[model samples]
Target chain A: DDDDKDQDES
Target chain B: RTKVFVWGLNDKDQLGGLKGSKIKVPSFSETLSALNVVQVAGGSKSLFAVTVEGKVYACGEATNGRLGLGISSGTVPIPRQITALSSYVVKKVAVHSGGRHATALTVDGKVFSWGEGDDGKLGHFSRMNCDKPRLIEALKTKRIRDIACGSSHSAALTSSGELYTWGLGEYGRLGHGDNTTQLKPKMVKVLLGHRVIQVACGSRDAQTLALTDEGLVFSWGDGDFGKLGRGGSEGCNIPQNIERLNGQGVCQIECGAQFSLALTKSGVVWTWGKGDYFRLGHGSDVHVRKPQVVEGLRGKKIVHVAVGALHCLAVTDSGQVYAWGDNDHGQQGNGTTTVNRKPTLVQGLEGQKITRVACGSSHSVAWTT
Candidate 1:
């Protein structure tokens, strides 16, 4: 889930 | 006269011999000073430098075996040569921000990869992480001339102008007709007759851009934020020529997190797609569905350009450095954390040095001066 959350968070 | 300078995010020691969460100004890399580095690439939390002697040195987080150091734990605070590749004369190295893998190309047209192999990003024909660089046997016959790495995918171009893609195929970034993961290198049948001169992969977004000898650009995969540069935000499973830049004499193409940039033969730069943090350098943080010339940099002859997740960098013919877009982690090397809406001279510390190449990671910057 963290990997998915890392997408475009910036 | 070749020197390496690094700045910005160092949380994982990716800046080499630097300490701090982020470096606001470009700092000379003492760790790489002794070597004549010709090319440098930055990953999310790691960096790779290639010397004129064709030697490769890696640093930063070694997790997932991204450093090719034969170990996957701890961090490399200093740059260390990857002895495994010493036998080969490596010409170029590529790594993407947020990517857990890295790829390198040798002078003899050989390909090697190491790091997290989830989805087969290593192109070893298996989903296994490699602690050391391993040759991609499937590409042995093809004479790979260029290579690119996406977050979870890899692409290679051959001397005969054929393009091969492997690894995660989500959104059809591999340019195959369908979204099926590739564990080994497979030629993109769609571009069979066309001679591909160059290839680029997005760092965070699952997309691919290819340039043909005819000065045409083709894009496929995730098209969100108009990254495809086709005047639409719709995803394309197959490679399609960007009609807007078709006759624009595109000499080079570069892609960031959610945008694309094109350098024309006449020394003009065009940007399209996501404008968040002014990454497009269009003077407004608005998504561009079509290519628009970066007005502020029109007067200069841009020779090279590079991009990452949230920023862009350019090197002009006059030995001047211009940067725009996000500075969240001071990746812009502007001596402060302020987003730039237009191209401006990069801050101090690079007064007389002629920047020959530039690279960007997720939140950091590296320059080959």
Candidate 2:
């Protein structure tokens, strides 16, 4: 889920 | 007109959203509002803003825990509007030390405060942090030109060229020649002759930048980072002349902990912090008493931002440069590599940032991406 993301798709 | 996607420090810079962001996080983002902004400012745990359209908005830090909404930290982390200001078009917004307490000035010449009013950083004589905006009592009779905040103290300048201070004055951040914390506003006569153009407050003391008829630059405040710019890292209780920072004048600038950045000639430059490579403004990591930042010397610089222990800046070329303390990936480099040199934020290589500002421990910026 996008809610608890530590990293994102840059 | 937006640019790159440099996302390193989840430091409130539009990392989509955040949690446990920084040691002293208090960030404001343009994404929270549909309005575009020309600039931004932040205080300890709260944020105040002005839309490119001139409408003002505030969020975080006003709720229970005191804002009557027990929103806790994260629950209070988002942006919320102050209903009392539906009609007041704010030209500028700044938060003092107490987030629950704030100070604002209208373009026309009026000042108002809300949130915590105990020590009266809010400008009213007696009141706690209000959920909405209210006119400043001591300043209600004066046409206020601008407002600035420090740890728990605040300062305001009037259109007629008078200055007043309140709140925790034990550190002398108020410049009122006394050691008592003002429950309301009081005039600072020692600074009589000087006409204060703008001011920035810090946790320890404060700074006043005057656009004098004569060509000169001056800085004063907590000497923690030697912000006085008088050739040594010594703090002063009163404003002093910084001839070393001569050629550069402090027209519009921002302050944090013990550092300051002056936006002159369309470029943003910094000085008065410590000598950590990350804190030094010059290209090399030399302990400059009060030297100019040669990095964006001729580059068109618009905004300079600060995260708790670090510094973040955006150049006119859309290049975002950051320094100081970034060990926790607070620099937005996507890596936890702490740096001292003005390193370019890889994520925001070529983006057009409309505006940006810093909070206690984190920061945020708006771009047309």
Candidate 3:
């Protein structure tokens, strides 16, 4: 889930 | 008899750190009760001390609109004078930008009030007019702000809903709007959509922004001065970019100064990067740390809080001792005459006091016991 992500993949 | 003892550069009478002044340490108003000061914040040449009774005291040069709300401008206020404009609200936190020409206070109810230099619209006022008293940022009146930060010429606020708002000088893309434009009113940083930001800190002089999420991740944007953004290179980011190096560290707090960045971990370790010169990073040398490096001096010290100035950095240890380093043109590190294996806590003719928090500016440092 992107909710608890440490980094974002753009 | 409790009061704050200030030393350093006070040339413009940033009040405490006067330039070439033979007076070593000057305590805040000899009349101020020591036990009343709960929190303090320092700007380039000015200071704000908030008491447990919800009173705010300001001192320093009253020029360029920095010491607003006090009804003074051209002269110097050597001792703290209660600024009654914000008397109605209980200020929980205060922030003074690098130059101390501007400042902001956050009340317990999450309202934001600003005074001082609004030149870059950093004051969030609708115009370039300078304010001589604390005024509520009407634009954010209805929203419950969780945290607020001020840069050299910009300001940011984190809302209770995890939304981020920015205004002021938009240069260096500090506003995170993907463009260089000034904001006279608070606007949402759209690039952070879908992210619940928990904390935000901006650089003292430059347009650098750092945010921490509830998920324990850190993101950076704006001018990457000395690689302060820690995105692997010294480049500008108009939007929030994940600082992969800090992944899973559970960062609890973050602070910034002129062009450097600092983060505190849940486990009590401090990681610093960016301009490492002047011993500000406490790595014992002038090496520019390209990425976050755990300060070896505090390896097992268990740092609980940290604050930064233009060329110096300070931290408070769980053991109640404070540490500081950088330029002091003191017979020892205590007065910048020497160096600090660690730091000092200022008191008015007293000893063995516990410091709940500390604040620093270009010339003076303050802390509440």
Candidate 4:
């Protein structure tokens, strides 16, 4: 439920 | 030997038998009372002590060749001996790998020196060579390594410029290079190059990697057995991913045991997850924890330090008390008994001295007074 903090930096 | 030391002439050779008896010197704890031990480390069977004077001393079994820095390879060293190779440098930090087969030393000048079993490039020597003495990792020569860590057979280093590097057995992508290819030298983890990492820790037994960002975010990868990655499942990730569960937690430090993950928040709260067998999680139960949760028994206690071994965990309170838990079958608990406690219990025989530092392995536990 804490997925909002995810970042997809290449 | 960097500092010119003067030894008073022994008229009757009291310092030694002059040839025989081998009269032992005072215990390192006693002789080094003036040096002030600031850090401690160990291999599975060896012990390392670093003094405030910037010197390191080692003792214990030398079967793995990691204890060669102590100048001996067999029996025991009742008093820790100074590692001659590192005499010119003042060590600022120290860490050893699981099973005590390899070790890493970080000097104040930002140089990293490693030795022992270099299998799979864990020693960062760029070759599969077992070094019996402290040797500088040439691959990191141009980088000022500020921090370093050791997993069971892998190693990681963080440069002062906020860059992260990994090498050694690439099993399950522990190297974090976006693939499972083994590296024989220090290789920067490009996946995490997007963030400025402040610290990194590896699961000593689980072969996992955890990195805490300067922004208070936590990222994990590698083996995720028992949900150690805090990703809500037990799946390993080759590319580093942020642990959403730690959002807004402001985690400042991270530590890994055999298969569990531990974190210390900015406010001094301790959190743990992953394999819960033998009460290694310190959550009062043997059930696996998928998210970071504050350890219940330590709610009111202000913890200043925490250390994990192959099967146990240790913490030091700000009020000068030490707590230990997990497996005790190997007598590594240091509680004078071989009984495992499901909750945090005061460490035995440590009082008044105030434990400034602590270290342990599979067979022994050491605390710096």
Q: How far is candidate 1 from the true structure (C-alpha RMSD, Å)?
A: 2.6
lDDT of 3 by residue, B1-369 (tens): 335545554555544333453224434434334537766666645666667767666666566655555444564555454464445454544463344444344464434344444444454444443545444455446444544455444444445444444444434434454544443444445544544444445553343444545443434444444434443444443544445445645444444453443444543334344443333444454434344444544454434444545334333443333444444422112533444433343323244243443444444443435
Give model 4's docking category: incorrect
In model 1, what are the clashing residue pairs, if there are any? none
DockQ each candidate and list the results: 0.11, 0.04, 0.01, 0.01
What is the C-alpha local distance difference test score of candidate 3? Answer: 0.45
> Could you give candidate 2's per-residue lDDT for residues B17-104 as a string of tens digits?
4544431222223345344544345544444556655666544444422222323334344455555666877787766322345566
Query: Which of 1 and 4 is ahead in DockQ?
Result: 1
Q: Residue B9: error of model 1 in Å?
A: 0.8
lDDT of 2 at B100: 43
User: Interface root mean square deviation of every model, in Å?
Assistant: 6.6, 9.0, 17.9, 24.4
Candidate 4 shows a clash count of 3
- Chain B alone, TM-score, model 4: 0.72
Native contacts retained, all candidates in order: 0.00, 0.00, 0.00, 0.00
Report the Cα lDDT for residue B355, model 3.
Answer: 43
Give the distance in Å from residue B368's predicted Cα in candidate 3 to where it truly belongs. Answer: 5.0
Q: Rank the candidates by lDDT, best first.
A: 1, 2, 3, 4
Q: Rank by TM-score, descending?
A: 1, 2, 3, 4
Candidate 1 wrongly placed segments (more than 4 Å) = A1-10, B363-369
DockQ of 2: 0.04
Most accurate candidate by lDDT: 1
Candidate 1 lDDT tens digits, B136-164:
99998889989988888899999999999
Tens-digit per-residue lDDT, B223-307, candidate 4: 4444344544444434344454445444444444534434455333444444433334343444344444445444544444444
Q: Candidate 2: misplaced stretches above 4 Å?
A: A1-10, B1-33, B52-54, B61-74, B96-100, B205-215, B232-234, B266-268, B282-288, B294-309, B317-337, B349-360, B367-369
